Design a protein around this nucleic acid. Structure first.
Ligand SMILES: Nc1ncnc2c1ncn2[C@@H]1O[C@H](COP(=O)(O)OP(=O)(O)O)[C@@H](O)[C@H]1O
Ligand code: ALF
Ligand SMILES: [Mg+2]
Ligand SMILES: [Zn+2]
Lengths: 656, 171
RNA sequence: GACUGACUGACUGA
RNA sequence: UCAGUCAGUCAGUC
């Protein structure tokens, strides 16, 4: 209530208060959410007595969903309209068919709406009478926003009432454009995707929009790599030794993969090693002698790849982290003892070099320098730090916690709901706790990608990007986090290519903000004509564009695990096998490593590879497996191919 | 009469900061400048003079952002910020366009100008004077450290192109 | 709290 | 056109 709408906010609603499907574009930090509120309030009051209208609000990321839901709840609490939400976190949700009808304003995460549409609980999209998309820029390709819009367009073009469509965005994006013409191509295609008709941008009140909204400045920091690194030398020499051992046993190793001029620290080397794994695994002989060859190649390749990952982790984190990674792998995990000795032979040297402070990673040193100067300048500041991956989040957290130099900082984390690769992220109450804490004692946030597209942590004076890059949409959303005035962004990187990419991205942004000024001069009906043309053409394209007993062997020791004709899917997702023979083909660990249920492991003492885990279903617990760990060989022919997920492989599925 | 001309040393120069050949001009480099790695280096965009002082006055001009000028002695730790550890007495221009003084790790708040340092441990007196068109009087206090004292400076290091230099006015 | 499955987008490389 | 990493989202069993 106490908010007094600013001029440009009133200006940005008229095209949508009139009832035309619209796209609303304004710089980051404008009052888009408030504008959506005004549009919804004015649309709600229009219906005559006896007829009521539902509003839907999508939002694709959970923290954003909670923030938007709270804003809507507080604003429309007074009037008495009833708001609600359906998401993935809700447990044993009461029927969605009923919850939609009971409540007027529904906030969803779009994949829910697609679920219900395909299932048939919501019959037809005609129920809703307003749709609001909080990232108009995502509606393309096969993103769930676009699948909702596909259903809508299919309903309109062929042959009831159909709902109004709004979208809010701060940057519509240029796709693959090279000149202004290609940008216009892409922007018109976007507008066509969601039944657009008007693009609304601030023009009259630009003078005011400049005073209230502050554009943060940008800066680039290029960091010298080390003159000489001891860690890299030692590990690379170990890798070369292992590579020579790999060379010996197989007649040819280079031919298996076309990739060439491999370097030790790159991702290219990772691709080489994986392709070599997947090529050696399919070598066949006319039949027990080659088992030793396969096992050996498995081991050499595996340890080589793990050293590679160590080098990369070392590049992006403190050296101690890489040493910890390697030590943990060797603790957990014949030839194995040979290479265990080969690592322990040098381990003390690595421990020595790790703790010598003069070899501290230069990037992290620059991060310390920048944080220290900035926080000394203004003692009250809040920083966001964007990192590519989840492991780097924990590494940087450790680094901040126990560095004497950066005492002021008091970190917090923020990642996404899902749990992947032995790290598990925050749950919804945890995210709410962190964000409300910022509203407090915390003074720096460590985020993955999920904290883009509007987290709205006011009073941010510093965004730091730790080798973070992408298409211009990402650049605009990331640079816009610093809502507070006086804010800065620092792109901090070691590779010159990234520094170049950010400059070309700034140029692309300028081109986009020109090609959207151009499109506002067309007549009011040429737009509608060409949009209908694009919609129809794309509908035609999309509509017509769609219309035994193989033995399973071990990926590492090539022993007859089971047969396809003896696997019965259970509840259509978990997979299981039956028979006393299979119960002899593995030996469950008496005290499994996680303990937290028992895992599976290969029967032989020679081979111990992760076949699966054990889970309990109703009365009887059953053994489940993962296809990543087997190799399929035909019952008659000798063919062999590798399937990463169950979905590619096709067998005579029969229910439990 | 008691005026001296302190000269910046390469001993404590910070990687980011840079110095001129005349050795009376200090600025912030556009790019990092490599230097030997030692615990002597500040690791913060600061600098320490070399004219050890155990009746000395010296004038630094602050024309051409944020600056701290002060006196600190060799005991001070490199990683700690100038003016906020015990041994160091400094005058700083905050980021909120106010002029503050840090003495004996105590905050004391108080329009900018070109400033001097006048110290005499003979009576344990430390004085600052902001002299532009008039002999304006700045914060003055009492402080005595056993070790001989050195002039010191801190120049905001994220913003390239701000330089601090030393003026040797004459009688 | 940890378990198994599918979906999508972005970035590389050949 | 095929590959390899990454990050978000949904479903089911405990
Ligand atoms: N009328 C107003 N007066 C003052 N502040 C406002 C007003 N409307 C919105 N804001 C502030 O602007 C902030 C950012 O708006 P938001 O919708 O998050 O921008 P974005 O377009 O990035 O989503 C909101 O947190 C709100 O507090
Ligand atoms: F909708 Al935004 F930053 F673009 F919250
Ligand atoms: Mg927003
Ligand atoms: Zn095996």
């Amino acid at each position: 209530s106490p908010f007094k709408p600013r001029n440009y906010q009133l200006e940005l609603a008229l095209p949508a208060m009139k009832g035309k499907n619209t796209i609303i574009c304004a710089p980051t930090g404008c009052g888009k959410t408030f504008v959506s509120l005004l549009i919804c309030e004015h649309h709600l009051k229009k219906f005559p007595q006896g007829q009521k209208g539902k509003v839907v609000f999508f939002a694709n990321q959970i923290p954003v969903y909670e923030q938007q839901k709270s804003v809507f709840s507080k604003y429309f609490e007074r009037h008495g309209y009833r708001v609600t939400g359906i998401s993935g976190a809700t447990a044993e949700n009461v029927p969605v068919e009923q919850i939609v009808e009971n409540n007027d304003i529904i906030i969803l995460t779009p994949q829910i709406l697609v679920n219900n549409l395909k299932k048939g609980t919501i019959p037809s999209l005609s129920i809703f009478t307003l749709m609001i998309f909080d990232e108009c820029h995502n509606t393309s390709k096969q993103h769930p926003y676009n699948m909702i819009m596909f259903n809508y367009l299919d309903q309109k073009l062929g042959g009831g009432p159909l709902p109004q469509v709004i979208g809010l965005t701060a940057s519509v994006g240029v796709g693959d454009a090279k000149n202004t013409d290609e940008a216009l191509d892409y922007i018109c295609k976007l507008c066509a995707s969601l039944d657009a008709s008007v693009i609304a941008t601030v023009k009259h009140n630009l003078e005011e929009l400049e005073q209230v909204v502050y554009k943060p400045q940008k800066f680039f920091r290029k960091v010298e790599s080390r003159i000489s690194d001891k860690f890299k030398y030692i590990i690379a020499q170990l890798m070369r030794d292992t590579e020579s051992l790999a060379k010996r046993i197989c007649k040819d190793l280079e031919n298996l993969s076309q990739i060439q001029n491999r370097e030790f620290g790159t991702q290219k080397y990772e691709q080489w090693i994986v392709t070599v794994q997947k090529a050696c695994m399919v070598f066949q002989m006319p039949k027990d002698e080659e088992s030793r060859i396969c096992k050996a190649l498995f081991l050499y390749t595996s340890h080589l790849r793990k050293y590679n990952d160590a080098l990369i982790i070392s590049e992006h984190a403190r050296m101690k982290d890489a040493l910890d990674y390697l030590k943990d792998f060797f603790s957990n995990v014949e030839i194995e003892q040979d290479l265990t000795q080969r690592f322990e032979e040098k381990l003390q040297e690595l421990e020595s070099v790790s703790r010598d402070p003069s070899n501290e990673n230069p990037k992290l040193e620059d991060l310390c320098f920048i944080l220290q100067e900035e926080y000394h300048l203004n003692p009250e500041t809040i920083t966001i730090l964007f990192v590519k991956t989840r492991a780097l989040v924990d590494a940087l957290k450790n680094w901040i916690e126990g560095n004497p130099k950066l005492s002021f900082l008091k970190p917090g984390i923020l990642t996404g709901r899902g749990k992947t690769n032995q790290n598990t992220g925050m749950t919804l109450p945890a995210q709410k706790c962190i964000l409300d804490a910022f509203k407090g004692d915390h003074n720096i946030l460590i985020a993955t990608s999920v904290a883009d597209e509007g987290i709205d942590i006011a009073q941010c004076n510093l965004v730091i990007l730790y080798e973070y890059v992408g298409n211009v949409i990402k650049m605009i959303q990331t640079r816009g986090r610093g809502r507070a005035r006086g804010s800065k962004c620092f792109l901090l990187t070691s590779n010159a290519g990234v520094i170049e990419k950010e400059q070309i991205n700034m140029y692309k942004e300028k081109m986009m903000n020109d090609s959207i000024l151009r499109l506002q001069t067309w007549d009011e009906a040429v737009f509608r004509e060409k949009i209908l043309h694009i919609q129809t053409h794309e509908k035609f394209i999309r509509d017509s564009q769609e219309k035994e007993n193989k033995k399973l062997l071990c990926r590492k020791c090539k022993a007859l695990a089971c047969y396809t004709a003896d696997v019965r899917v259970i509840e259509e997702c978990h997979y299981t096998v039956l028979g006393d023979a299979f119960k002899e083909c593995f030996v469950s660990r008496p005290h499994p490593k996680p303990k937290k249920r028992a895992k599976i492991f290969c029967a032989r003492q020679n081979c111990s590879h992760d076949w699966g885990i054990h889970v309990k279903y109703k009365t009887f617990e059953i053994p489940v497996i993962k296809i990543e760990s087997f190799v399929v060989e035909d019952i008659a022919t000798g063919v062999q191919t590798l399937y990463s997920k169950w979905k590619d492989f096709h067998f005579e599925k029969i229910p439990f | 009469q008691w005026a001296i001309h302190p000269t910046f040393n390469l001993k404590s120069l910070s990687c980011s900061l840079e110095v001129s050949k005349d050795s009376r001009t200090v600025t912030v480099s556009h790019r990092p400048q490599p230097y030997r790695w030692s615990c002597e280096r500040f690791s913060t965009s600061q600098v320490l003079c070399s004219q050890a002082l155990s009746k000395h006055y010296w004038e630094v001009d602050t024309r051409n952002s944020h600056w701290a000028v002060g006196v600190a002695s060799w005991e001070m730790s490199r990683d700690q910020v100038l003016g906020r550890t015990m041994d160091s007495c400094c005058v700083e221009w905050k980021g909120t366009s106010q002029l503050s003084a840090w003495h004996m790790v105590k905050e004391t708040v108080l329009r900018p100008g070109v400033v001097g340092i006048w110290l005499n441990l003979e009576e344990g007196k430390l004085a600052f004077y902001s002299v532009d068109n008039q002999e304006k009087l700045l914060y003055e206090c009492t402080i005595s450290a056993s070790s001989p004292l050195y002039p010191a400076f801190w120049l905001y290091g994220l913003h390239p192109g701000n330089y601090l230099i030393i003026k040797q006015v004459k009688v």
